[PDB]
Amino acid sequence: ESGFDYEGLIDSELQKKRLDKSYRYFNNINRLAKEFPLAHRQREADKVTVWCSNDYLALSKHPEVLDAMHKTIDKYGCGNIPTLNLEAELATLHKKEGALVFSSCYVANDAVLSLLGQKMKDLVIFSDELNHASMIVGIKHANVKKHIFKHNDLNELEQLLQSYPKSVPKLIAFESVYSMAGSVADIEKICDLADKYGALTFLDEVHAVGLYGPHGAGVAEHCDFESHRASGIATPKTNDKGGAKTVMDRVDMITGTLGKSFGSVGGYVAASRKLIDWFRSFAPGFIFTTTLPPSVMAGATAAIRYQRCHIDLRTSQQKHTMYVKKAFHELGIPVIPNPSHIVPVLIGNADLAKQASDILINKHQIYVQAINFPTVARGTERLRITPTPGHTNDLSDILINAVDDVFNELQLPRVRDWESQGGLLGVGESGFVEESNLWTSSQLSLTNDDLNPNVRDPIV
Amino acid sequence: GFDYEGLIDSELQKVTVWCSNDYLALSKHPEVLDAMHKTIDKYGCGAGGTRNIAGHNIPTLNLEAELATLHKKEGALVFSSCYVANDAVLSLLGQKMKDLVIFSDELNHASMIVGIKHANVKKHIFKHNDLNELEQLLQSYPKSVPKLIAFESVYSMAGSVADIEKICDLADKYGALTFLDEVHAVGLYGPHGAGVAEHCDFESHRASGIATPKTNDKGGAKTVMDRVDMITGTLGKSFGSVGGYVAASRKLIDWFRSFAPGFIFTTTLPPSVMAGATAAIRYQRCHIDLRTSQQKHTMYVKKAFHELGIPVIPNPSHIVPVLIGNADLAKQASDILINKHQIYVQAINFPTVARGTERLRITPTPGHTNDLSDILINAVDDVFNELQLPRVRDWESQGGLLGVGESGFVEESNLWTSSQLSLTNDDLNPNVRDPIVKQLEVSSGIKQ
């Protein structure tokens, strides 16, 4: 007899990814700690400027992080105190009673969501349609009834919550900042809905932490910006609206990554002591026994300590992003509007977006990855640009001219052109209301001395 | 509304390290530390992206190439950790083949159990290392039904070893894929540390060195390690780093690379962490004295415990489980060892092992010299007297347990023979020393 043809199945599936052009080719990119934001390709001599990297504050190369790794390597080796220090800093950042570190936030999401579903079998999960793959996977592994609500539609969310008695356990799983379009959730309104319908909230701040709030604790902290800034590390007595509890205090579970802004690898959840011990006790034991090396944790800890007391990292990134956005607006470069740090440039065609990404790196030595289906809906294909404190106006100008040339060379649609067909995603749409940038001019003018002195080198 | 806090409350209500995960003591080795220091200075700390965005680089390409070279496989893929690797591969197998039938050894560790659950396919658990029942389970299906046999090379709690060749024979006959977890093997077995699969043809691999041998140890066409369809391992134990990987055909690697969300959607491991692992893999490949050292240190302890009647569960591997038989006494022996004797050994209890089998797990390394073993040996002997713990003769009077004091029990012979323990680094093929390992295309994607 003959066995199942395994290689045939694998071949047919990989061939489909070749047909639809979703088969992926990784670019060799070696980021230079000394030359940030430069990187070199397989040949060290060929250098490019990285505009798509997710290291938002450039802390991957920062002296206090590199020194933390070097000194921690000498003492601990490569592969305890370092875990408690890191977990204590993360709990401090979010002003939560505790935090739990995992190998990655992908794991953190999968583990927490899975555990909530296993322990409450009646649980009903309400999930934003744009939630990250890790959260989709965790919700699946939770093996409970779920409802996907249209992106950031709070109207639809409420009617889904209404269909249940309040006594039914519920979880609302969403993100603060969604990276592909740079949209932002309304966290206070979701907290209000949670209180009304008796639901826990699960918030993924991965693209927020370090970039938002006075100390970079994320959008939940930005929600009461003045209350947190005044109180510093301490919990404020009242919120920005005068109430008893802050939004960040009202969210039950906050997950983040160490791999993005914090210039490291890892993931965590911050929540109340009861929740942390619950996860710590009943989650699969092997995600705790196998974890990050101490040198990696020390680096992330240093980055968190540094970024909490330096707001200039956030005001620097925001200013550089605005610079790029304003320039593109004057040139008719179709940026998808959003009140965040992300600069998605709308293309609208998958083939053209690839060609634009290729021309940018080969002709102009600019690295920007193109975004197409499945990651985005067909026809919405875009170039995702992510400014950092390290992209100074001089580098931005080069990017701006290079993008403008690519648009001319490929005759790609401008803002003017998208309007002619009615507009897309707020680009060229008559009477479209754009949300104001989360960072207000008042907040962008703040400096590090405006932060409470208790955030600088506190004992933790 | 619903009471969450009530439910949570209801459920809730200098030393010498002998239990460590770093088997070759390479985590602090100079060549690993030097690779990290140098990679840090050049690359910084984190990768700054995923493999698709900004997170694909030279240290990744070198690591995956070195792993594929170690296992003599067309390709290898690195994951955040070992449990991510197992969960990714197993999940995708069950996702893409929904009819697949998984045959799992009863002692597979939680990571494999979780991965098989996430595969969401029919499964059969066969008694540990029972290949008669496995063959009976495989024969009850036509050959055409896709099957996966999932097992480990070394089971870490009792130190027993699977027969990999025989399972491959069963997989060829009944038309099944094999998924082998070498996490507790790689670096410790085979001439070059490629694991038990390499040890299965020890002399063919030692002769050929880096190269694929033309025949196996029996004269046949394919080595055991070549016949295994998927080999998973960790960078977190013998290689003194963090991470996980699978080694397989380039088509399988491209499949995981393309379809596995746990590979795609997470940040790439720091470049320095990868350089560190690569340095360890290269050093350990061409130093067999690390493996002979660990085996001799493990055997030294076992012999001394034997002459003292300390009840070690017999195994042909690097592990020294010490049978206690009671959970509270095992914890109490561990507490005494660390507080009184400054010896750290963690007690292993239920669920990990069956109640009444509770034990102390000891993992010697090349860094445990006989002088350190002597301190361990004397401390355990004292603790056994202080707590009145049963000795071998005592287990012998009760009929024996797990091969301790069992009448007419023949112990499995060590995987490392006397001939193999006599080898030195000069007995390895020179081509494993300072080899030039070319990067792999499948790591970046294949062009057609």
JSON list of N, CA, C and O in Angstrom, two decimals, chain A residues 6-7 11 13 18 23-24 26-27 29-31 33 53 60 70 74-75 78 103 170 198 263 278 367, chain B residues 4 11 27-28 37 41-43 45-48 54 56 58 83 96 147 175 240 251 254-255 257 444 446:
[
{"chain": "A", "resi": 6, "resn": "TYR", "atom": "N", "xyz": [2.47, 13.43, 1.95]},
{"chain": "A", "resi": 6, "resn": "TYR", "atom": "CA", "xyz": [2.65, 14.60, 2.81]},
{"chain": "A", "resi": 6, "resn": "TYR", "atom": "C", "xyz": [3.32, 15.72, 2.04]},
{"chain": "A", "resi": 6, "resn": "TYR", "atom": "O", "xyz": [2.92, 16.89, 2.15]},
{"chain": "A", "resi": 7, "resn": "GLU", "atom": "N", "xyz": [4.34, 15.38, 1.25]},
{"chain": "A", "resi": 7, "resn": "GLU", "atom": "CA", "xyz": [5.03, 16.38, 0.46]},
{"chain": "A", "resi": 7, "resn": "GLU", "atom": "C", "xyz": [4.11, 17.02, -0.57]},
{"chain": "A", "resi": 7, "resn": "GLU", "atom": "O", "xyz": [4.23, 18.21, -0.86]},
{"chain": "A", "resi": 11, "resn": "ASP", "atom": "N", "xyz": [3.40, 20.92, -0.75]},
{"chain": "A", "resi": 11, "resn": "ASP", "atom": "CA", "xyz": [3.67, 21.62, -2.01]},
{"chain": "A", "resi": 11, "resn": "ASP", "atom": "C", "xyz": [2.46, 22.41, -2.48]},
{"chain": "A", "resi": 11, "resn": "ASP", "atom": "O", "xyz": [2.59, 23.57, -2.89]},
{"chain": "A", "resi": 13, "resn": "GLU", "atom": "N", "xyz": [-0.05, 23.63, -0.77]},
{"chain": "A", "resi": 13, "resn": "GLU", "atom": "CA", "xyz": [-0.36, 24.76, 0.10]},
{"chain": "A", "resi": 13, "resn": "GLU", "atom": "C", "xyz": [0.63, 25.90, -0.12]},
{"chain": "A", "resi": 13, "resn": "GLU", "atom": "O", "xyz": [0.23, 27.07, -0.21]},
{"chain": "A", "resi": 18, "resn": "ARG", "atom": "N", "xyz": [2.24, 31.16, -3.29]},
{"chain": "A", "resi": 18, "resn": "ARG", "atom": "CA", "xyz": [2.96, 31.75, -4.40]},
{"chain": "A", "resi": 18, "resn": "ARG", "atom": "C", "xyz": [2.02, 32.37, -5.42]},
{"chain": "A", "resi": 18, "resn": "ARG", "atom": "O", "xyz": [2.32, 33.43, -5.98]},
{"chain": "A", "resi": 23, "resn": "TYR", "atom": "N", "xyz": [3.29, 34.59, -0.42]},
{"chain": "A", "resi": 23, "resn": "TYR", "atom": "CA", "xyz": [4.55, 33.97, -0.05]},
{"chain": "A", "resi": 23, "resn": "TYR", "atom": "C", "xyz": [5.57, 35.07, 0.24]},
{"chain": "A", "resi": 23, "resn": "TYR", "atom": "O", "xyz": [5.65, 36.06, -0.48]},
{"chain": "A", "resi": 24, "resn": "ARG", "atom": "N", "xyz": [6.33, 34.89, 1.32]},
{"chain": "A", "resi": 24, "resn": "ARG", "atom": "CA", "xyz": [7.14, 35.97, 1.88]},
{"chain": "A", "resi": 24, "resn": "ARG", "atom": "C", "xyz": [8.63, 35.69, 1.70]},
{"chain": "A", "resi": 24, "resn": "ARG", "atom": "O", "xyz": [9.09, 34.55, 1.83]},
{"chain": "A", "resi": 26, "resn": "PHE", "atom": "N", "xyz": [12.17, 37.15, 3.28]},
{"chain": "A", "resi": 26, "resn": "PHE", "atom": "CA", "xyz": [12.72, 37.97, 4.34]},
{"chain": "A", "resi": 26, "resn": "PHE", "atom": "C", "xyz": [13.95, 38.72, 3.85]},
{"chain": "A", "resi": 26, "resn": "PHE", "atom": "O", "xyz": [14.74, 38.19, 3.06]},
{"chain": "A", "resi": 27, "resn": "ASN", "atom": "N", "xyz": [14.10, 39.96, 4.30]},
{"chain": "A", "resi": 27, "resn": "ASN", "atom": "CA", "xyz": [15.23, 40.79, 3.93]},
{"chain": "A", "resi": 27, "resn": "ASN", "atom": "C", "xyz": [16.30, 40.70, 5.00]},
{"chain": "A", "resi": 27, "resn": "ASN", "atom": "O", "xyz": [16.00, 40.80, 6.20]},
{"chain": "A", "resi": 29, "resn": "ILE", "atom": "N", "xyz": [18.69, 42.23, 7.21]},
{"chain": "A", "resi": 29, "resn": "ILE", "atom": "CA", "xyz": [18.80, 43.58, 7.74]},
{"chain": "A", "resi": 29, "resn": "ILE", "atom": "C", "xyz": [19.51, 43.47, 9.07]},
{"chain": "A", "resi": 29, "resn": "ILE", "atom": "O", "xyz": [18.99, 42.85, 10.01]},
{"chain": "A", "resi": 30, "resn": "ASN", "atom": "N", "xyz": [20.70, 44.07, 9.17]},
{"chain": "A", "resi": 30, "resn": "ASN", "atom": "CA", "xyz": [21.50, 44.04, 10.38]},
{"chain": "A", "resi": 30, "resn": "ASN", "atom": "C", "xyz": [21.57, 45.46, 10.91]},
{"chain": "A", "resi": 30, "resn": "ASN", "atom": "O", "xyz": [22.28, 46.31, 10.35]},
{"chain": "A", "resi": 31, "resn": "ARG", "atom": "N", "xyz": [20.86, 45.73, 12.00]},
{"chain": "A", "resi": 31, "resn": "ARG", "atom": "CA", "xyz": [20.75, 47.08, 12.52]},
{"chain": "A", "resi": 31, "resn": "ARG", "atom": "C", "xyz": [22.00, 47.41, 13.31]},
{"chain": "A", "resi": 31, "resn": "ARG", "atom": "O", "xyz": [22.44, 46.62, 14.15]},
{"chain": "A", "resi": 33, "resn": "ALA", "atom": "N", "xyz": [23.99, 49.20, 16.03]},
{"chain": "A", "resi": 33, "resn": "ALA", "atom": "CA", "xyz": [23.84, 49.88, 17.32]},
{"chain": "A", "resi": 33, "resn": "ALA", "atom": "C", "xyz": [24.55, 51.22, 17.33]},
{"chain": "A", "resi": 33, "resn": "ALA", "atom": "O", "xyz": [24.09, 52.15, 17.99]},
{"chain": "A", "resi": 53, "resn": "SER", "atom": "N", "xyz": [11.20, 49.76, 11.41]},
{"chain": "A", "resi": 53, "resn": "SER", "atom": "CA", "xyz": [11.47, 48.95, 12.59]},
{"chain": "A", "resi": 53, "resn": "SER", "atom": "C", "xyz": [10.54, 49.32, 13.73]},
{"chain": "A", "resi": 53, "resn": "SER", "atom": "O", "xyz": [10.11, 50.46, 13.88]},
{"chain": "A", "resi": 60, "resn": "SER", "atom": "N", "xyz": [17.03, 49.94, 21.89]},
{"chain": "A", "resi": 60, "resn": "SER", "atom": "CA", "xyz": [17.78, 48.70, 21.71]},
{"chain": "A", "resi": 60, "resn": "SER", "atom": "C", "xyz": [19.28, 48.94, 21.77]},
{"chain": "A", "resi": 60, "resn": "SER", "atom": "O", "xyz": [20.03, 48.05, 22.16]},
{"chain": "A", "resi": 70, "resn": "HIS", "atom": "N", "xyz": [25.82, 43.82, 29.25]},
{"chain": "A", "resi": 70, "resn": "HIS", "atom": "CA", "xyz": [27.23, 43.48, 29.44]},
{"chain": "A", "resi": 70, "resn": "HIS", "atom": "C", "xyz": [27.50, 43.10, 30.90]},
{"chain": "A", "resi": 70, "resn": "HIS", "atom": "O", "xyz": [28.07, 42.04, 31.18]},
{"chain": "A", "resi": 74, "resn": "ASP", "atom": "N", "xyz": [28.45, 39.20, 32.40]},
{"chain": "A", "resi": 74, "resn": "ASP", "atom": "CA", "xyz": [29.65, 38.85, 33.17]},
{"chain": "A", "resi": 74, "resn": "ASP", "atom": "C", "xyz": [29.28, 38.08, 34.43]},
{"chain": "A", "resi": 74, "resn": "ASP", "atom": "O", "xyz": [29.92, 37.08, 34.76]},
{"chain": "A", "resi": 75, "resn": "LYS", "atom": "N", "xyz": [28.25, 38.53, 35.14]},
{"chain": "A", "resi": 75, "resn": "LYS", "atom": "CA", "xyz": [27.87, 37.90, 36.40]},
{"chain": "A", "resi": 75, "resn": "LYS", "atom": "C", "xyz": [27.07, 36.62, 36.19]},
{"chain": "A", "resi": 75, "resn": "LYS", "atom": "O", "xyz": [27.38, 35.58, 36.78]},
{"chain": "A", "resi": 78, "resn": "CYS", "atom": "N", "xyz": [25.11, 33.57, 30.01]},
{"chain": "A", "resi": 78, "resn": "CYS", "atom": "CA", "xyz": [24.16, 33.78, 28.91]},
{"chain": "A", "resi": 78, "resn": "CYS", "atom": "C", "xyz": [22.75, 33.32, 29.28]},
{"chain": "A", "resi": 78, "resn": "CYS", "atom": "O", "xyz": [21.87, 34.16, 29.54]},
{"chain": "A", "resi": 103, "resn": "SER", "atom": "N", "xyz": [7.92, 34.47, 27.78]},
{"chain": "A", "resi": 103, "resn": "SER", "atom": "CA", "xyz": [8.90, 34.49, 26.70]},
{"chain": "A", "resi": 103, "resn": "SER", "atom": "C", "xyz": [8.57, 35.55, 25.66]},
{"chain": "A", "resi": 103, "resn": "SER", "atom": "O", "xyz": [9.47, 36.10, 25.02]},
{"chain": "A", "resi": 170, "resn": "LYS", "atom": "N", "xyz": [-18.02, 37.60, 31.27]},
{"chain": "A", "resi": 170, "resn": "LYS", "atom": "CA", "xyz": [-17.70, 38.17, 29.97]},
{"chain": "A", "resi": 170, "resn": "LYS", "atom": "C", "xyz": [-16.28, 38.74, 29.97]},
{"chain": "A", "resi": 170, "resn": "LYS", "atom": "O", "xyz": [-15.76, 39.16, 31.00]},
{"chain": "A", "resi": 198, "resn": "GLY", "atom": "N", "xyz": [-20.91, 43.79, 33.39]},
{"chain": "A", "resi": 198, "resn": "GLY", "atom": "CA", "xyz": [-20.26, 42.82, 34.26]},
{"chain": "A", "resi": 198, "resn": "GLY", "atom": "C", "xyz": [-19.18, 42.01, 33.57]},
{"chain": "A", "resi": 198, "resn": "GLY", "atom": "O", "xyz": [-19.13, 40.79, 33.71]},
{"chain": "A", "resi": 263, "resn": "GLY", "atom": "N", "xyz": [13.28, 47.59, 23.28]},
{"chain": "A", "resi": 263, "resn": "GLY", "atom": "CA", "xyz": [14.56, 47.23, 22.69]},
{"chain": "A", "resi": 263, "resn": "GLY", "atom": "C", "xyz": [15.13, 45.91, 23.16]},
{"chain": "A", "resi": 263, "resn": "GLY", "atom": "O", "xyz": [16.35, 45.78, 23.33]},
{"chain": "A", "resi": 278, "resn": "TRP", "atom": "N", "xyz": [-3.17, 33.92, 40.17]},
{"chain": "A", "resi": 278, "resn": "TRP", "atom": "CA", "xyz": [-4.03, 32.99, 39.45]},
{"chain": "A", "resi": 278, "resn": "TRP", "atom": "C", "xyz": [-3.33, 32.48, 38.19]},
{"chain": "A", "resi": 278, "resn": "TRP", "atom": "O", "xyz": [-3.18, 31.27, 37.99]},
{"chain": "A", "resi": 367, "resn": "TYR", "atom": "N", "xyz": [14.57, 51.34, 3.71]},
{"chain": "A", "resi": 367, "resn": "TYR", "atom": "CA", "xyz": [13.91, 50.07, 4.00]},
{"chain": "A", "resi": 367, "resn": "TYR", "atom": "C", "xyz": [12.53, 50.34, 4.60]},
{"chain": "A", "resi": 367, "resn": "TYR", "atom": "O", "xyz": [12.41, 50.81, 5.74]},
{"chain": "B", "resi": 4, "resn": "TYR", "atom": "N", "xyz": [-15.87, 37.22, 39.91]},
{"chain": "B", "resi": 4, "resn": "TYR", "atom": "CA", "xyz": [-14.57, 36.74, 39.46]},
{"chain": "B", "resi": 4, "resn": "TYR", "atom": "C", "xyz": [-13.62, 36.52, 40.63]},
{"chain": "B", "resi": 4, "resn": "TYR", "atom": "O", "xyz": [-12.91, 35.51, 40.68]},
{"chain": "B", "resi": 11, "resn": "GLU", "atom": "N", "xyz": [-9.97, 29.00, 44.03]},
{"chain": "B", "resi": 11, "resn": "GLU", "atom": "CA", "xyz": [-8.93, 28.15, 43.47]},
{"chain": "B", "resi": 11, "resn": "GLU", "atom": "C", "xyz": [-7.59, 28.36, 44.17]},
{"chain": "B", "resi": 11, "resn": "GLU", "atom": "O", "xyz": [-6.85, 27.40, 44.41]},
{"chain": "B", "resi": 27, "resn": "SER", "atom": "N", "xyz": [26.99, 28.08, 29.38]},
{"chain": "B", "resi": 27, "resn": "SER", "atom": "CA", "xyz": [26.36, 29.39, 29.47]},
{"chain": "B", "resi": 27, "resn": "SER", "atom": "C", "xyz": [27.39, 30.46, 29.83]},
{"chain": "B", "resi": 27, "resn": "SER", "atom": "O", "xyz": [27.31, 31.60, 29.35]},
{"chain": "B", "resi": 28, "resn": "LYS", "atom": "N", "xyz": [28.34, 30.13, 30.69]},
{"chain": "B", "resi": 28, "resn": "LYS", "atom": "CA", "xyz": [29.42, 31.03, 31.07]},
{"chain": "B", "resi": 28, "resn": "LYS", "atom": "C", "xyz": [30.72, 30.79, 30.30]},
{"chain": "B", "resi": 28, "resn": "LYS", "atom": "O", "xyz": [31.74, 31.40, 30.63]},
{"chain": "B", "resi": 37, "resn": "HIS", "atom": "N", "xyz": [28.96, 39.60, 23.87]},
{"chain": "B", "resi": 37, "resn": "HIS", "atom": "CA", "xyz": [29.52, 40.93, 24.04]},
{"chain": "B", "resi": 37, "resn": "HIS", "atom": "C", "xyz": [29.75, 41.59, 22.69]},
{"chain": "B", "resi": 37, "resn": "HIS", "atom": "O", "xyz": [29.37, 42.74, 22.46]},
{"chain": "B", "resi": 41, "resn": "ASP", "atom": "N", "xyz": [27.54, 44.86, 21.06]},
{"chain": "B", "resi": 41, "resn": "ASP", "atom": "CA", "xyz": [28.14, 46.12, 20.64]},
{"chain": "B", "resi": 41, "resn": "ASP", "atom": "C", "xyz": [27.74, 46.46, 19.21]},
{"chain": "B", "resi": 41, "resn": "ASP", "atom": "O", "xyz": [27.51, 47.64, 18.89]},
{"chain": "B", "resi": 42, "resn": "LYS", "atom": "N", "xyz": [27.67, 45.46, 18.34]},
{"chain": "B", "resi": 42, "resn": "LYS", "atom": "CA", "xyz": [27.36, 45.71, 16.93]},
{"chain": "B", "resi": 42, "resn": "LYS", "atom": "C", "xyz": [25.86, 45.87, 16.69]},
{"chain": "B", "resi": 42, "resn": "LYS", "atom": "O", "xyz": [25.43, 46.81, 16.01]},
{"chain": "B", "resi": 43, "resn": "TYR", "atom": "N", "xyz": [25.05, 44.94, 17.21]},
{"chain": "B", "resi": 43, "resn": "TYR", "atom": "CA", "xyz": [23.61, 44.90, 16.92]},
{"chain": "B", "resi": 43, "resn": "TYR", "atom": "C", "xyz": [22.73, 45.57, 17.96]},
{"chain": "B", "resi": 43, "resn": "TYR", "atom": "O", "xyz": [21.53, 45.74, 17.70]},
{"chain": "B", "resi": 45, "resn": "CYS", "atom": "N", "xyz": [20.68, 45.40, 21.61]},
{"chain": "B", "resi": 45, "resn": "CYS", "atom": "CA", "xyz": [20.05, 44.37, 22.44]},
{"chain": "B", "resi": 45, "resn": "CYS", "atom": "C", "xyz": [19.04, 43.56, 21.64]},
{"chain": "B", "resi": 45, "resn": "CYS", "atom": "O", "xyz": [19.29, 42.40, 21.29]},
{"chain": "B", "resi": 46, "resn": "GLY", "atom": "N", "xyz": [17.90, 44.15, 21.32]},
{"chain": "B", "resi": 46, "resn": "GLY", "atom": "CA", "xyz": [16.84, 43.44, 20.64]},
{"chain": "B", "resi": 46, "resn": "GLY", "atom": "C", "xyz": [16.96, 43.45, 19.12]},
{"chain": "B", "resi": 46, "resn": "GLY", "atom": "O", "xyz": [17.71, 44.23, 18.52]},
{"chain": "B", "resi": 47, "resn": "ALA", "atom": "N", "xyz": [16.19, 42.57, 18.49]},
{"chain": "B", "resi": 47, "resn": "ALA", "atom": "CA", "xyz": [16.20, 42.48, 17.03]},
{"chain": "B", "resi": 47, "resn": "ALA", "atom": "C", "xyz": [15.45, 43.65, 16.40]},
{"chain": "B", "resi": 47, "resn": "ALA", "atom": "O", "xyz": [15.74, 44.03, 15.26]},
{"chain": "B", "resi": 48, "resn": "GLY", "atom": "N", "xyz": [14.49, 44.22, 17.12]},
{"chain": "B", "resi": 48, "resn": "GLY", "atom": "CA", "xyz": [13.76, 45.36, 16.60]},
{"chain": "B", "resi": 48, "resn": "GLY", "atom": "C", "xyz": [12.72, 45.03, 15.56]},
{"chain": "B", "resi": 48, "resn": "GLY", "atom": "O", "xyz": [12.32, 45.92, 14.81]},
{"chain": "B", "resi": 54, "resn": "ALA", "atom": "N", "xyz": [12.07, 43.77, 9.57]},
{"chain": "B", "resi": 54, "resn": "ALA", "atom": "CA", "xyz": [13.23, 44.30, 10.28]},
{"chain": "B", "resi": 54, "resn": "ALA", "atom": "C", "xyz": [13.95, 43.31, 11.19]},
{"chain": "B", "resi": 54, "resn": "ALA", "atom": "O", "xyz": [15.04, 43.62, 11.68]},
{"chain": "B", "resi": 56, "resn": "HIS", "atom": "N", "xyz": [15.05, 40.07, 10.51]},
{"chain": "B", "resi": 56, "resn": "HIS", "atom": "CA", "xyz": [15.78, 39.00, 9.84]},
{"chain": "B", "resi": 56, "resn": "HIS", "atom": "C", "xyz": [17.19, 39.49, 9.55]},
{"chain": "B", "resi": 56, "resn": "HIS", "atom": "O", "xyz": [17.37, 40.58, 9.00]},
{"chain": "B", "resi": 58, "resn": "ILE", "atom": "N", "xyz": [21.82, 38.36, 10.01]},
{"chain": "B", "resi": 58, "resn": "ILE", "atom": "CA", "xyz": [22.90, 37.39, 9.86]},
{"chain": "B", "resi": 58, "resn": "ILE", "atom": "C", "xyz": [22.95, 36.42, 11.04]},
{"chain": "B", "resi": 58, "resn": "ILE", "atom": "O", "xyz": [23.10, 35.21, 10.82]},
{"chain": "B", "resi": 83, "resn": "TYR", "atom": "N", "xyz": [9.02, 25.35, 23.82]},
{"chain": "B", "resi": 83, "resn": "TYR", "atom": "CA", "xyz": [7.60, 25.06, 23.89]},
{"chain": "B", "resi": 83, "resn": "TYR", "atom": "C", "xyz": [6.82, 25.78, 22.79]},
{"chain": "B", "resi": 83, "resn": "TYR", "atom": "O", "xyz": [5.74, 25.32, 22.39]},
{"chain": "B", "resi": 96, "resn": "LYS", "atom": "N", "xyz": [-3.58, 21.57, 9.21]},
{"chain": "B", "resi": 96, "resn": "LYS", "atom": "CA", "xyz": [-3.58, 21.34, 7.77]},
{"chain": "B", "resi": 96, "resn": "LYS", "atom": "C", "xyz": [-4.01, 19.93, 7.39]},
{"chain": "B", "resi": 96, "resn": "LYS", "atom": "O", "xyz": [-4.54, 19.73, 6.30]},
{"chain": "B", "resi": 147, "resn": "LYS", "atom": "N", "xyz": [-0.57, 9.80, 9.72]},
{"chain": "B", "resi": 147, "resn": "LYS", "atom": "CA", "xyz": [-0.28, 9.51, 11.12]},
{"chain": "B", "resi": 147, "resn": "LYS", "atom": "C", "xyz": [0.97, 10.26, 11.55]},
{"chain": "B", "resi": 147, "resn": "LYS", "atom": "O", "xyz": [1.87, 10.51, 10.76]},
{"chain": "B", "resi": 175, "resn": "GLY", "atom": "N", "xyz": [3.16, 4.07, 7.47]},
{"chain": "B", "resi": 175, "resn": "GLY", "atom": "CA", "xyz": [2.98, 5.31, 6.74]},
{"chain": "B", "resi": 175, "resn": "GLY", "atom": "C", "xyz": [2.83, 6.56, 7.58]},
{"chain": "B", "resi": 175, "resn": "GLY", "atom": "O", "xyz": [2.00, 7.42, 7.27]},
{"chain": "B", "resi": 240, "resn": "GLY", "atom": "N", "xyz": [23.28, 26.71, 26.30]},
{"chain": "B", "resi": 240, "resn": "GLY", "atom": "CA", "xyz": [23.53, 27.84, 27.18]},
{"chain": "B", "resi": 240, "resn": "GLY", "atom": "C", "xyz": [22.97, 29.15, 26.69]},
{"chain": "B", "resi": 240, "resn": "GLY", "atom": "O", "xyz": [23.64, 30.19, 26.79]},
{"chain": "B", "resi": 251, "resn": "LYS", "atom": "N", "xyz": [11.35, 21.68, 2.68]},
{"chain": "B", "resi": 251, "resn": "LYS", "atom": "CA", "xyz": [9.94, 21.90, 2.37]},
{"chain": "B", "resi": 251, "resn": "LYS", "atom": "C", "xyz": [9.12, 22.02, 3.65]},
{"chain": "B", "resi": 251, "resn": "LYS", "atom": "O", "xyz": [8.27, 22.90, 3.77]},
{"chain": "B", "resi": 254, "resn": "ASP", "atom": "N", "xyz": [10.01, 25.44, 5.21]},
{"chain": "B", "resi": 254, "resn": "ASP", "atom": "CA", "xyz": [9.30, 26.51, 4.53]},
{"chain": "B", "resi": 254, "resn": "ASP", "atom": "C", "xyz": [7.82, 26.50, 4.89]},
{"chain": "B", "resi": 254, "resn": "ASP", "atom": "O", "xyz": [7.18, 27.55, 4.97]},
{"chain": "B", "resi": 255, "resn": "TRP", "atom": "N", "xyz": [7.26, 25.31, 5.11]},
{"chain": "B", "resi": 255, "resn": "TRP", "atom": "CA", "xyz": [5.88, 25.19, 5.55]},
{"chain": "B", "resi": 255, "resn": "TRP", "atom": "C", "xyz": [5.67, 25.85, 6.91]},
{"chain": "B", "resi": 255, "resn": "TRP", "atom": "O", "xyz": [4.77, 26.68, 7.08]},
{"chain": "B", "resi": 257, "resn": "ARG", "atom": "N", "xyz": [7.75, 28.01, 8.37]},
{"chain": "B", "resi": 257, "resn": "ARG", "atom": "CA", "xyz": [8.07, 29.41, 8.18]},
{"chain": "B", "resi": 257, "resn": "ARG", "atom": "C", "xyz": [6.86, 30.18, 7.65]},
{"chain": "B", "resi": 257, "resn": "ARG", "atom": "O", "xyz": [6.59, 31.31, 8.08]},
{"chain": "B", "resi": 444, "resn": "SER", "atom": "N", "xyz": [15.37, 32.51, 4.28]},
{"chain": "B", "resi": 444, "resn": "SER", "atom": "CA", "xyz": [14.86, 33.74, 3.70]},
{"chain": "B", "resi": 444, "resn": "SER", "atom": "C", "xyz": [13.68, 33.52, 2.76]},
{"chain": "B", "resi": 444, "resn": "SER", "atom": "O", "xyz": [13.11, 34.50, 2.26]},
{"chain": "B", "resi": 446, "resn": "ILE", "atom": "N", "xyz": [12.26, 30.63, -0.51]},
{"chain": "B", "resi": 446, "resn": "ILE", "atom": "CA", "xyz": [12.80, 29.97, -1.69]},
{"chain": "B", "resi": 446, "resn": "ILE", "atom": "C", "xyz": [12.19, 30.57, -2.94]},
{"chain": "B", "resi": 446, "resn": "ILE", "atom": "O", "xyz": [10.97, 30.80, -3.00]}
]
